[PDB]
Design a protein around this ligand. Sequence first.
Ligand code: U5G
Ligand code: U5G
Lengths: 301, 301
Amino acid sequence: SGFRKMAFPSGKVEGCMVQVTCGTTTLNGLWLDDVVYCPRHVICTSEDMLNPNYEDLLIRKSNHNFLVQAGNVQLRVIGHSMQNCVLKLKVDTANPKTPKYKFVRIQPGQTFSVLACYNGSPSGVYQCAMRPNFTIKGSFLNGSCGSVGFNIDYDCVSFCYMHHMELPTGVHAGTDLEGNFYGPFVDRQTAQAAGTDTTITVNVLAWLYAAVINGDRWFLNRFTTTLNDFNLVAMKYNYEPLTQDHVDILGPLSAQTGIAVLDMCASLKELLQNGMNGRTILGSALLEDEFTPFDVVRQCS
Amino acid sequence: SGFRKMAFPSGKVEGCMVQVTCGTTTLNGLWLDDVVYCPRHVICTSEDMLNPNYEDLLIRKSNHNFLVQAGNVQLRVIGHSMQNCVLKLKVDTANPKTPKYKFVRIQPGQTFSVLACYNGSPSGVYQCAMRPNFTIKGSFLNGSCGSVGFNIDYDCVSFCYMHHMELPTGVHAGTDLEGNFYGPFVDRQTAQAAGTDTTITVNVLAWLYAAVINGDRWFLNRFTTTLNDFNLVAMKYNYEPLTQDHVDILGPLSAQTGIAVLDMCASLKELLQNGMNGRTILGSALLEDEFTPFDVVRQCS
Ligand SMILES: *[C@](O)(C(N)=O)[C@H](CC1CCC1)NC(=O)[C@@H]1[C@@H]2[C@H](CN1C(=O)[C@@H](NC(=O)NC(C)(C)C)C(C)(C)C)C2(C)C
Ligand SMILES: *[C@](O)(C(N)=O)[C@H](CC1CCC1)NC(=O)[C@@H]1[C@@H]2[C@H](CN1C(=O)[C@@H](NC(=O)NC(C)(C)C)C(C)(C)C)C2(C)C
């Protein structure tokens, strides 16, 4: 019983966090086998970041320009390369705490846990969703760059995010672990517009199913809608369109609760048109959209 | 920038979680040095739990009645004792992953991270507050008993909660790590009334300071109140009284933001009397009360 924003246990990732220093710039790195991954702008001075040519900046760097600290132990860099927006520092020692892992590039609307780190030391863990506009609403201060986002499936850590930058609205942007940014952003200190964000409709529906599983039921009704009629209301309230693939994904939850997906859409439509009128769902006065259907099944086990 | 419900990194606790089986009952245990701590009702059958005499039930148990599994390895119990509502199983092996640790009994309104576990395997981590009525609003399913709550300060894990039971409202109750329940509850399957809960006033104020630190400022005003006048409004809205000790604790946050504690009380009073009128604070449409002043200082670092 109960429903919380639940992150994955962070131990397997904690053992991979290191500190990377280049000149006067210090941030976090991810130590897997004998490679340390970190944002490539660790090689930049502040005046470099305004319009950097990373090829030129890196060609002027040597292995001894990179100071990597794994706790108390300093790791010797024996090689460096650049992949997209990440820097790969080959080190002399294989991380003995390397878990079974993969790199994955996630789709918008998917969730992951973030291990916030500073100077290579983990500070906290929390859940985030990749927004439809490919930003994330994290909690990041100066020094958090290189912190990673991840999911776990049995004994495998799927890394999906590395933190690079903060947007003027206080939201955050970064890359997959192969250095490709999510969204249209670039690692250059220049005006960059984030797209207008939207609400992740399939996640709101999954969260409504979690509420029913936990006994929150006041929002249900006997009406129904068509998938096409629901999407016309969703468009008005800046919700993402619901597809039949979304309906199929919500299959197991609909079967467990006995509430057809299109029936739950009718209840969501009324919540959008009427509001909640002083009531709450799972302790929230807002419609919550950073729980995936998998997140609900996992926690409501 | 940003503000999230942030749990402590869970790695140090993950290495302590084991599985304890007694007959047909299986739950989680905490393995520290050569002792395994778990809820004492692991020795109960379902008909025992309706009105158990734990002294009689335990006197009929032997060491070989306790099956402890640490991952793949089975731990041999060489001794057992009962402390309040916890069972202490002495094992033949000292846990090599034992962190620096303490047992602490927390005050209501304090927060902690929970590592939800099933069959000795960590499932997720989230933040909880000890409610004024000494329940917690966790996320616990069958098999989660023995999961622990904790805080971390540098390299020391302060354990403060072990999970025992679910209340009919879906809220949760448990003990400190020395077996003393929080609140009036007992580990017996009998009607037990939880006290009427209240809102943790000092935490709401801390969260309002976090909002100002992050640029959420619409709720401020130029009014002020007296501590006595504020507490009269707090009593009407089922908020806990604010003490001068609470005011002193909010000192560092008030100094960082330049907003006097009693000035923030005036803004909270207006939020209570008027509502938020379709606005949000730190992404919430409700006044949030499970962030302590320490939680804010830690995350808004
Ligand atoms: C990390 O590298 C770190 N050391 O933790 C750092 C985190 C930020 C939080 C303040 C310091 N990231 C950057 O410094 C990042 C590097 C330059 C500029 N960066 C920013 O995050 C800037 N944002 C920004 O200019 N955003 C746009 C370009 C306007 C959209 C800050 C103004 C927040 C510093 C680069 C390469 C993007
Ligand atoms: C744990 O021991 C476990 N194995 O995970 C278990 C968790 C609950 C969640 C359903 C199983 N806790 C108990 O079984 C606990 C043991 C008996 C009864 N318990 C309950 O949690 C019951 N609650 C309850 O009766 N609450 C009161 C007494 C009405 C306030 C359940 C009805 C939820 C099983 C004891 C000793 C309290």
